[PDB]
Design a protein around this ligand. Sequence first.
Ligand SMILES: NC(=O)c1ccc[n+]([C@@H]2O[C@H](COP(=O)([O-])OP(=O)(O)OC[C@H]3O[C@@H](n4cnc5c(N)ncnc54)[C@H](O)[C@@H]3O)[C@@H](O)[C@H]2O)c1
Ligand SMILES: [Zn+2]
Lengths: 212, 50, 69, 108, 165, 185, 22, 99, 98, 213, 97
Amino acid sequence: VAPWVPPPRHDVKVTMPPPPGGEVGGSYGVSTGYSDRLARTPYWKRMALSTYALRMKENETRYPMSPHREGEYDLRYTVTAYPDHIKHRPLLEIGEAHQIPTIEIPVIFLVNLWDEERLTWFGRQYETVYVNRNVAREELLPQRYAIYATEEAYKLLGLPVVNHSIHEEIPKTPHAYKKLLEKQSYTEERWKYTIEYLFRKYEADPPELQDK
Amino acid sequence: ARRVQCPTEWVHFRMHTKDKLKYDFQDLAFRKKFEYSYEDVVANAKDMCS
Amino acid sequence: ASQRWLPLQTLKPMGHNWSAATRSSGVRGPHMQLMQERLDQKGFGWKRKSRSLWQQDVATAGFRPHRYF
Amino acid sequence: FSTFALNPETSRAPHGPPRGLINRYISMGLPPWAAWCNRVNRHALYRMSDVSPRSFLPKAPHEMDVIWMNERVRERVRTSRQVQHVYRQLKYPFVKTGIHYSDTLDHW
Amino acid sequence: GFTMKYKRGTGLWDEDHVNDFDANKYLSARSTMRWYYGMERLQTRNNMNARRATQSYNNNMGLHHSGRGAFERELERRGIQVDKYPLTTTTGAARVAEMVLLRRQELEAHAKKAMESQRQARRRDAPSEWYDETEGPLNPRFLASMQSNYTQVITELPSSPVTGR
Amino acid sequence: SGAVGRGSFHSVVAGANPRRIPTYYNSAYELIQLHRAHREVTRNFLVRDKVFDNKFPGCSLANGLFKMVPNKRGNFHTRELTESIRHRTIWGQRIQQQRTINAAILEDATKVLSPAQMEDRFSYRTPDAAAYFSPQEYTAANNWPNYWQHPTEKHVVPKPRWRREPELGGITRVRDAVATPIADY
Amino acid sequence: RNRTQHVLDWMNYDGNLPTHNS
Amino acid sequence: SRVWVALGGKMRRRRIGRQIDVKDMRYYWRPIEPQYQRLYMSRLRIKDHSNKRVQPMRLRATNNDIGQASSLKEWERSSDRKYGAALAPPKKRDFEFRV
Amino acid sequence: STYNEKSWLEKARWGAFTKGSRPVMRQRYSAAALKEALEMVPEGFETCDVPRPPQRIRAQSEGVVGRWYTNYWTLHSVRYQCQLAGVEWQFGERQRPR
Amino acid sequence: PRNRYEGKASFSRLSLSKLLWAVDTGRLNPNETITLYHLRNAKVIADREVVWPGMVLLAGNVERVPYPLHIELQNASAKAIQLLEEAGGSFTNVYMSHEGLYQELHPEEFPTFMEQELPERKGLENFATNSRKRGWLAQWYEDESRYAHPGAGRRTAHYIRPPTDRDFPATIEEYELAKHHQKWHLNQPGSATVLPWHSLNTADMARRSAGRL
Amino acid sequence: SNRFFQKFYLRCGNCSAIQRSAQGYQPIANPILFKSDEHCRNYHDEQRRAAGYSGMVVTCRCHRCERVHSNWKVLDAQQFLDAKLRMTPEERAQRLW
RNA sequence: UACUCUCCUUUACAAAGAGAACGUUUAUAUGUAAUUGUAUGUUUGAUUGGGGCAAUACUAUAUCUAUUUAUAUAGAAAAAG
Ligand SMILES: NC(=O)c1ccc[n+]([C@@H]2O[C@H](COP(=O)([O-])OP(=O)(O)OC[C@H]3O[C@@H](n4cnc5c(N)ncnc54)[C@H](O)[C@@H]3O)[C@@H](O)[C@H]2O)c1
Ligand SMILES: [Zn+2]
């Protein structure tokens, strides 16, 4: 028995139905929203509470996209109201082998950390290092030496917001990774690709003309 | 709570017929939508002189 | 009339691509399976390449011993 | 599908609507495994165009325990070895023991 | 499925393009009243059914029961006609067919009087030479209906074929 | 599109059409399919304006509305009706165009030799047309379906010496003495 | 490529439903 | 009189050493003997039996009957699939067409 | 799903879904009812940007409403009645890129 | 042996005797260029005989055509052409795409000219641009199409605009491929242009290999 | 291997210069000698571009800051009009083209 | 119901991938643990072919011969081979 059947999720607008569930956070599977508050109020009522300048703001057609689920197509215009299967695909397709290789993520070190075995620096303080995915999770993060290098982590610390595109795309094959290492070697560690670093060999005399 | 309170095999009258349209089906709340009466379908379609 | 001149026929040094005694020879439609499509160089090889497929349909060229075929 | 060595990218099909059989099923959105259907009924090219995936969750949505982000137990139709029998099987995702350090509650 | 729905009302009468296999050879007195009342019912039973659906579905979409959104309400407030072709409304048809009947009726009385101009210009107080029956006997019923257009009696036919007088 | 003599845009190739004004054509078949087409556009407007006259009081409650849902009538007017006007207009031109030529032919022709022979030069009076139009004039064939009544064959049917019978009720009754039919072998 | 033959004649036909005079 | 002409029997398997003037009897469009004409063309007659004046279905689809399906008073409103759309060239779409 | 919004018969009939040989804007506006629609096409807009939604998206123009010019089907349908009406389409045409 | 693929040129035969029989009977007007609309709407040919390749004029036993007759049909037979052309007529073979086949038969549904796409490439090869049929593009093809871009060299004579600032191969792999090809094929004149060594055997890339001219 | 055409509107992260980069027609790997890995990962990858570069790093060179990076946020073309229509006519000369 | 020879749904063995925290996915394998189907036909236990001699009969009758040829479909040869 349902005493006080809840009101529809996003019924907050005066002369158009609430957006369908799922889009607001609810159960998918139905396209067209409907709220008995809106359909009962006679037309003049719905035209009383609203001026023309307003209906043109809630008539507003955000046609393919969804105004609420930012970035995903409106789920009353898809073939069926469920979420877009294609965007949220599981990382392994129905037949491929799981050859997702070892991936190294960027972490912002928070204390000057200095290895005592290689006698050099895991990382300075407040500089993002690409560390292993199971050093970070199991050794660097539990102790407070590091955090992830996400956009908002930069915001919280005081550093210019840098987009490492942290796991923006996972590679499902080693040579599909060793290309992603080539992309990330360019954007992140860009000083490797300057006309000054491609010529440390030659900032002075070609070595065959110097003294001995 | 939004669900309809009966195993939907009892309210299957709503889901297969053309009541698929005349009914709210958000998360299985098989509740009728608004529906004009016949005193109004002609009150709204004669006042337009349609 | 116009005195324009044209030869009687067009001789193209092109060679026919359908020999009556060659098996998969012919001019196939624009959406037929091109010569040895999916075969990968082996007799009925498109069957052998089925286990290699990632995921097939639910009704996919299964077992069918030519019985009254 | 074209036969030249170096096919530079272009706006449209350079040599007419792409020829071949597998280009026939890609020209309609289907995946290239439609080339291996024996019957392609109006339901079949619906079934395999992935309009709505034939793929479900092991337990109820309400009783679900292990965090399955966006996954189902998709069934993979395999065709057997030398004599091509078609059988299908339900392939799960790989659940790892997520032993994290959520620094909110300062403990693993 | 697809059942020629674009033909339901597009017939010339009410009993057309409605597949009703349930017929009979002789539909009796009240089976005919039941029939005619039936065709129109499932012609108005269908319509107001299909009107309540469109008017209710439109009302649930927040817009006027005939689909008129905020725009086509705002234009009519301005006087700018919002529909390209204003098909003639019920006031039209019920008037565009109101005079035509007012015209025929004033033409009948215009013509009822007209034929009397020619009927009384028919001096024949005796039947013409169609009153022959050398081909085959006249019809006694008809003569009784043609007696009015004469003075001399017509129905009285002898046992013999008519001579002509 | 073609549908009239203007030539479809497929005279992209500048195909001219010389030796014109060459034919007088009475537009016989086209005026036929015009009267057929003009009947449709009127037989369509009749439908687009069907409005409930419920001669019964059971379902009288709609006697003011049209017989078609407003969205459908707003379609059928545009799908089938306004199409049928174009299809009516097309014949209303393929004929109004062909007449323009005939108007020019029937002047430049009337002069040369006769204003009497003219509408004979442009006639189609087949010698038998009396068969189809004024069959009372036609004799040269026997084209009745009830041929045994053609005046040249009326002498087949027998002229019975009939009579009335007041004792039977004015029933006509033939005075032929029936011939004793064949009976046995 | 313009349309030389019958260049007019598109605007001169189908006096729609001839009025009271004709 | 409809022959179902077929090709030679032995035209791909074993050629070396066969007779010189019989390696070519395999090249002519020979009729199949009528004892098989009637067998195969029997599955085509069944289309409307007991109707002594309908002809059998033909092997290939003649050009006029394909349209005969869409020349029916019920198909006159299907703009697509009419006048030949299957056997038409592949449809052309907006340059932005995409799935 | 115990309730499917639409049977597979109408998940698999794209003709009721796609924009192909099917008008997707029901209302046909008059002359002045268009010059008053284009009044809200904002300066800086250009048809060369609003793209065709993919096949998997339904073809539905909910009509002339707020920001209708972004509804690719409302735009190119209004753009077509401005032809039959004779209104001068100021904005640019679909630029097929090469 | 007689398959019809997607795009086959199989045309229903409109015997010239039929068309000549109508024009005197009075179903067809001899003045108006008798495009297939007239043939369809005058009940000369029905719906069940006009499929996508529109039709084909066949001079069947017609030894003579008496009056100047103009036609816009699809692929007349060479005799049928030389019969109309003798009597002062024309025949501009329209070879419309299917999208054009509709808008010619039911133009009462297209209030304005909705642009028509050129036919398939296979049609342009054989009818639309081939002056032997007086195809409607036999004027355009020679006038505007058959000329390359004013910048194209020898290799890029087929690109809408020459994709490089120089005819020659652009990079190494376009070169070594063409440096090997021009010797894989014995050194022919035009063999510089690399071509794919595999014949798809498609019917679309099939043009009349032998025939009249 | 994209059979169908589609143009994205990539927004840089360094200058937020909304530049558009299209995706032409690149033909399917040959089916005549089929290869199951190169095909079924050509297709599955094609849905991932067709859904607005879902699981891929975008690598195109900017037009404003002439350099190639991987920082682009792929704008759905009604998030683009959300942006384009909401920029003063001068910055449209700065961030757009 | 059964096993060296046929074949899947198969849960075991091995490889790989995850700083391998254990569950999955593959590849290669195919087990009578595997429940599929075949295991003949004709004369009685051998024979299966195309000829010929035996009254221009031939049950297999009786004898023998021998490039007397193995049609199609996928592969193999791309001109006529
Ligand atoms: N195969 C086809 O697509 C086909 C077949 C028959 C007719 N048509 C014609 O297509 C036209 C529409 O153009 P489209 O084919 O690009 O698709 P479309 O119908 O989507 O065209 C855009 C819009 O134009 C409007 N429109 C169409 N005809 C109109 C008219 N006479 N007056 C006012 N508004 C009108 C409608 O709102 C339509 O949705 C229609 O007029 C129709 O008769 C096309
Ligand atoms: Zn940038």
